[PDB]
Amino acid sequence: ITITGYSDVLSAGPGETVEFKVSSKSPHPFTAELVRVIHADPNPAGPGMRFEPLGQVFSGTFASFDKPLLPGSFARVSGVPAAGSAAGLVAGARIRPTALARGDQCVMSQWNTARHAGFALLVSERGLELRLGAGTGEPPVCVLCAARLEVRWYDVWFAIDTASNRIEVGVTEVDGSVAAPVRHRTLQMLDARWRAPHSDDAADLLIGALEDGRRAHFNGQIEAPFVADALPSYAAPRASDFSTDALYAAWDFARGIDTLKIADTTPHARHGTLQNLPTRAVRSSAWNGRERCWRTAPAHYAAIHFHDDDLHDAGWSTDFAFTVPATLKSGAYAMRLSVDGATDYLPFYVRPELGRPGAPLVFVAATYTYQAYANYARGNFDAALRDKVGRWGAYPHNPDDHPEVGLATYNLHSDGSGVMFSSRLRPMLTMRPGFLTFDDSRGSGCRHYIADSHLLDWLEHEGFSFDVVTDDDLERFGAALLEPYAAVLTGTHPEYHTAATLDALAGYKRSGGNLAYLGGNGFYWRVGRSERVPGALEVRRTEGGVRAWAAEAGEYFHALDGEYGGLWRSSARTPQQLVGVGFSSQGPFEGSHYRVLDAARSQPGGSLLKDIAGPLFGGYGLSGGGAAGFELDSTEAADGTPANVIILARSESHSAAFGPALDALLSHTATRARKTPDTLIRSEIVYYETGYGGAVFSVGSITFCGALSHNDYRNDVSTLLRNVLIRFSR
Amino acid sequence: MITITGYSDVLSAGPGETVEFKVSSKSPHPFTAELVRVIHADPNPAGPGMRFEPLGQVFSGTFASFDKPLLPGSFARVSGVPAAGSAAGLVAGARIRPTALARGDQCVMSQWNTARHAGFALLVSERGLELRLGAGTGEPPVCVLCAARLEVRWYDVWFAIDTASNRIEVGVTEVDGSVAAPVRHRTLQMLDARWRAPHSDDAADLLIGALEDRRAHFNGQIEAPFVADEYAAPRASDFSTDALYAAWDFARGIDTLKIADTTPHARHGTLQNLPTRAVRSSAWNGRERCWRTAPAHYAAIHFHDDDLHDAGWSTDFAFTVPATLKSGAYAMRLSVDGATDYLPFYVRPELGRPGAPLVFVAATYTYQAYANYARGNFDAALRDKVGRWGAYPHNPDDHPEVGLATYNLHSDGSGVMFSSRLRPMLTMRPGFLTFDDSRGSGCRHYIADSHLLDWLEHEGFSFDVVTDDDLERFGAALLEPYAAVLTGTHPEYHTAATLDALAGYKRSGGNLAYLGGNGFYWRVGRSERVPGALEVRRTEGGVRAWAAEAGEYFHALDGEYGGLWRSSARTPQQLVGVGFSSQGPFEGSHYRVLDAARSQPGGSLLKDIAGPLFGGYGLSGGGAAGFELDSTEAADGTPANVIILARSESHSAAFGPALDALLSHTATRARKTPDTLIRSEIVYYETGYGGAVFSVGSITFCGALSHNDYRNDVSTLLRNVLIRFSR
């Protein structure tokens, strides 16, 4: 990737600053040009790429620097002497290694590279290894304790004892009640192959990695590491076996589970800092199932889960800054970067000032959802799609070929556990104009930021001015930010929300506003977030539902904010309470048509179908060739669809590959309302008045907006949306 | 009409222990009780038919018949209290969430001296909120209606009698003021000496949830009732506490049957028929999910007009186990006027004093969870089949007076979380048929388990019997003396204690024979505080007759996290190597031997089984592999040394995957297609502790044992296993 980057914020209002951070592998400086993005789907059968060049609002040329991406989580303890004394050195931890086949993985190390002094305790398929620095002249001392370690809890340690002149390296299985508990040690004569360190041997202490030139990132859980300077007053030594004058450090990971800090409990207070956001709020060895909430039982959660592909905050220097001029209208923009024929875009949004709308409509860019899906390496970037990317001139870089940009919460880590965090402080290839997600046999295969530009393009063509706010903005400002608008429109797929963003949308309905839910599968998953950890989103896929992975029992509560994660249904807030329909069926990326219930034309809101002949409509579009496709929502009175709901149309004839949303099932033959599951395979367009003054219009299909521009913006789907927004702006 | 039925206080007793039998008999003649040992309880003409050993010379009696009633519907009784009110008047109210207003008058709170026509009652209905005041011996009661259309939401309800201003007020206000059209209604009526301050002789019990005139059982949640002696609803916090007659906080004692009064009057009460505690109250906002650490979010109780726990029937006779009566499955045959019933119980061996090499576990937790399951399938054809086969004559579908199963919904649509064993349990009767089985007997649980006990006796295997309740009490020590432990056809429901007894038994070096399907799936809650009650909350997902509400996942009885054992980090495969993977209709199919299996260890078990198929027959759905199926899953803990000896094939299309094993409708947790779940796998493996495990992973496996007079491949297979396990 010749040039890429990211921004610190994804939105800013008048007078606010966005910092852009670029990494470029060219020897020449790069150019940045401000553009407004109009249409981002490069399918020739569609409107194609469309920008408004705004080079005179902002343009620059800036020096190029190759900034690196370094995945893998670990903890650093800084400002510490080299551990050890003339009596010796002891260090250990309780561990659960989840992926020993991936090579040397360091539990704990302290390594002064220039002086070749220090220690390292690693695990691998060969067992437990101690590496001791031997000075300028000699290769490192290395002691292996051979053992076959499984994905289970172990105590591991090493002890250097000068008095008896021995090095001990040992591992013991924590649960003694199993058939064959592992207990091995290796004893080796010390023989002045080690001596007490000098003040200049000092170096940082790492947990989870080794810094001897950063490598050997650990996979799995680590709990209660400690370091001692003397013998205690065969079994594994632990922090409690020592008098506190021998303890160099004993870290208890249960303290500060919503922070990046690891606390030392000795009077030394040698605290440390986690890098690249490993997973806290996970079970530790004391967990027995009587406690499920880390907030009231921290001792059952005294572990951290490290992953050699964790990625959060690249730390890239800022190359240029941008302040929104008070005259620049609210909208979807990007900084176009250029070097040596290569392009990238840094997308961002200009947010209207609070209470000072610039248009009657406001669009919500579903950045929480974009971030949850960021850099989803789907394993689908094959020959046909790689070739399709060039023919259409689409964005060239896919996460499948570029694993250095990290994973999406829809991926698994290298140890097979679910990816619970997604950072926006890294290049987000999936949030790029012209990016293709699927090799769509019948359309463009576009999603999220790119699919949403179908709507923004259609709005501008049909003469609707609109402002833009993001999920972060609703998080910051609440319902007050939406209140001034005659209508709020969502993207194609607002899957991910916090209670604050749900509350903003609800409070907007209560203010009397109109809500146009123009997507499918909205309001499904909770995310967690925190002021302490900006730029990170947390997803825990609890209980059930349609999910790329399952959270483990007892790890259902978010680390960042302490809230119960998973499906919004599992926090008593169904989609149908917000928008009258809810996720009911999922299939492949293919669309179908709607059939008007013409009974609707008489009933309230049926005038919305004025100038749509029927009975069917919408059998076309840039997303799978059909206005009702991919993921579908339908009414359910038992989940809170209001009694005054007017079902205006219902989709039919999807392929057999469409199936029911698991969380709507009591069994494979019965839904929660005790219907057959096949009645879930349908998208229902509904309209209803909220009783607050305004109304709701919901389509319940992710591909609905992919039909808007069909046959040069003249089609039944375009007529329907014009009708809705004309109605909503009276 | 059920002429004679009854139940026992306990379902098992060891030497020197007593079982009390409680009978209701509608005959004017006395009934006889006779001890029998149950051999085979399946009345299918094509099978071994009913089979008992009469033990009338061990115990027989004759007893007077008494018609004892069944009275469903939960409520709270506060007794030993004066009649509420003062010369200034009377105020009473509560926060409620009514779940079924169409079912008629439902009493929030009442105190009614019937002889004196004195007291009050506040009720809700589709017509609104009604006050009834006693008016004295000569006159019918005063009634004040406040008309309103109430939905399933939280409301404050009240009435206030104020003599100074000569007004009666009845009112209801919707708790959530932020909704579009919040309900606020009241009715004002002039008092005019139509009510007067109570006298000491007007005293009577104060009820919450029903009226004693017992009728008008309430459906829904009640929170913070109280009594004191523009406009807003009065609440307990509005009163000086010496004007407060009582204010109950349901958050205290959530794991008890007691409701606490917070005034110095301490007018506590006792819940009847086991209403549902540990449920959300009005303050619940989603930040708390555990009642044990956030009681203020759970200060409501959910009443149901069909709750039923503890009939309170008097004991008619008792039986003490003689040291000479061997451990086994017995029953008390009741007899009067041509009518028969059976009261089943078990004789449990003494701890540490085995009487046989084998011990069988009667899965009484599973029986109880399914007790009196009214399936809606007792139609002409099955009613006709029941008479022809001479089967047990009474079905829950015809007798709602015996209450529901945890597989039913209450009349308000909420899940049935509790099942009492202190009531007639029609489904645990010899000869009771559950299904109209086109290919067999349609038998389940206690009756299906007797397929196995009959086969054991035929083949010369002596065996002792313990129940789930026994493992709860005694643990692995009760199992240790036996060379093998055998399960029933379907040990679905378990506690941490019963799982631990079986696991600890494996670690002691024992042999385990899992002869069923869908075992070790659901958690139950229980407590010594409430003997005879079992609790089920169907949390998260899985194949479930109903879904628990978010935030109500912890048991009231024991504070434990309910639902699937998977959701408490204990898969079936950790215990028996296979786990629930497919569910279908009551139909069985055959197994196919895995050709590798005969070579590696445990392959001798297939000795003298031709193959490659076997077991395409049986009294349960016509096949040894049917109904609910278990299979291996390495990701769920199937031990690496597991030997898959056979695998079922050719189940009907109606068979589908276990929901909790799915990440989506096209992928399992191990990322395979769901169709690979549709299979029963018989496995064998060594535990590493000295003994081995044999699991069949099929509910209908033992319905094949007696096929062709006990000579058949399934019978050969089980015989091989048990001789191996008893060497």
> Which string of DSSP letters, residue by residue, matches A554-607?
T--B-TTT--B-SBGGGGT--HHHHHS-EEEEEEEEEEE-EEE-THHHHSTTGG
3-state SS assignment for residue A700: coil
For residues A364 and A474, give the distance between their C-alpha atoms in angstroms, rounded to a whole number.
9
Residue of A300, A668, A678, A688 for testing the chain B interface, max B β-carbons within 10 Å: A668
Token pair belonging to A454? 């179908």
**B547 neighbourhood in chain A, CB within 8 Å:** 666, 672
Å from B563 to nearest chain A CA? 11
Does B133 fall in a domain?
yes
Could you tell me if residue A229 is inside a domain? yes
For residue B265, the enclosing domain spans 75-303
Q: Structure resolution in Å?
A: 2.5
**Inter-chain CB proximity B293 and A296 less than 8 Å:** yes
Q: Technique behind this structure?
A: X-ray
Element (H or E) spanning B144, and its range? strand B142-147
Separation CA B577–CA B633 (nearest Å): 8
Residue of chain A nearest B656, judged by CA positions:
A668
**Following CA atoms A547, A549, A552, A556 in sequence, which dihedral angle do they give, to the nearest 10 degrees?**
-50
State how beta strands A154-161 and A166-173 pair: antiparallel
Q: Flag whether A8 is in a domain.
A: no
Are B37 and B57 in contact by the 8 Å Cβ rule? The answer is no
**Which residue of A lies nearest to B293 if distances are taken between CA atoms?**
A296
Interchain CB distance below 8 Å, A692 and B561: no
- Compare CB distances from B663 to A547, A553, A665 and report the shortest one's residue: A547
**A550 contacts on B by Cβ (under 8 Å):** 663, 669
Q: Where are the alpha helices (DSSP H) in B269-418?
A: 364-369, 380-388
Nearest Cα to Cα of residue A225 among A144, A284, A309? A284
As a whole number of angstroms, the distance between CA A408 and CA A347 comes to: 18
> Structure tokens of B185?
């209604």
In a domain, A217, yes or no: yes
CATH of the domain at A290: 2.60.120.200
- Rounded to whole angstroms, the Cα distance separating B177 from B183 reads 9
| Closest CA in chain B for residue A541 | B663
| Contact criterion met (CB < 8 Å) for A289 and B561 | yes
DSSP H or E stretch at residue A361: strand A361-365
Beta-carbon count within 10 A of B240 CB: 7
- Give the number of domains in chain B: 1
* Of A311, A301, A407, A72, the residue nearest A207 (C-alpha): A72
How many CB pairs below 8 A link A and B? 91
**Residue B605, SS3 per DSSP:** helix
User: Is the CB of residue A352 less than 8 Å from the CB of residue A467?
Assistant: yes
Distances (CA, A) of A452 to A34, A374, B275: 20, 15, 51
Cis peptide before A433 (omega within 30 of 0): no
Q: Do B180 and A289 touch (CB under 8 A)?
A: no
Q: Cβ distance B216 to B209 under 8 Å? A: no
Alpha carbon B343 to chain centroid distance? 18
Q: Per the domain annotation, does B139 fall within a domain?
A: yes
Rounded-to-integer distance, Cα A144 and Cα A126, Å: 8
Q: Coil, strand or helix: which one is A510?
A: helix
Asked if A543 and B545 come within 8 Å (Cβ–Cβ), the reply is no
Does any domain span residue B541? no
Neighbours of A687 (CB within 10 A): 24
Question: Which chain B residues have any C-beta within 8 angstroms of a chain A C-beta?
Answer: 178, 180-181, 286-287, 289-290, 293, 496, 507, 539-541, 543-547, 549-551, 560-561, 566-569, 583, 654, 656-657, 659-660, 662-666, 669, 687-689
What residues of chain B lie within 8 A of the CB of A181, using their CB?
A: none
Of B289, B561, B659, the CB nearest to A662: B659
Which of B290, B547, B687 is opposite residue A672, by nearest beta carbon? B547
Are A668 and B660 within 8 A, CB to CB? no
Return the HEC string of B201-240: HHCCCEEECCECCCECCCCEEEEEEEEECCCCCCCHHHCC
Indicate yes or no: CB of B543 within 8 angstroms of CB of A667: yes
- Tokens matching residue A730: 């009276």
d(CA A101, CA A416): 12
B486: Cα separation from own chain's centroid: 23
Task: Give the residue carrying structure tokens 């690693």.
Answer: A122
Contact B685, B642 (CB under 8 A): yes
Query: Of B177, B163, B149, B279, which is closest to residue B221 (Cα–Cα)?
Result: B279
* Residue B160 falls in which region: left (phi positive, over 0), alpha (psi -120 to 50) or beta: beta
Residue B500, domain member (yes or no)? no
Helix (H) or strand (E) holding A509: helix A499-510
* Residues in chain A within 8 Å Cβ distance of B656: 667-669
> In chain B, which residues have their Cβ closer than 8 Å to the Cβ of A528?
none
Considering the domain boundaries, does residue A490 fall inside one? no
Strands B662-664 and A361-365, how do they pair?
unpaired
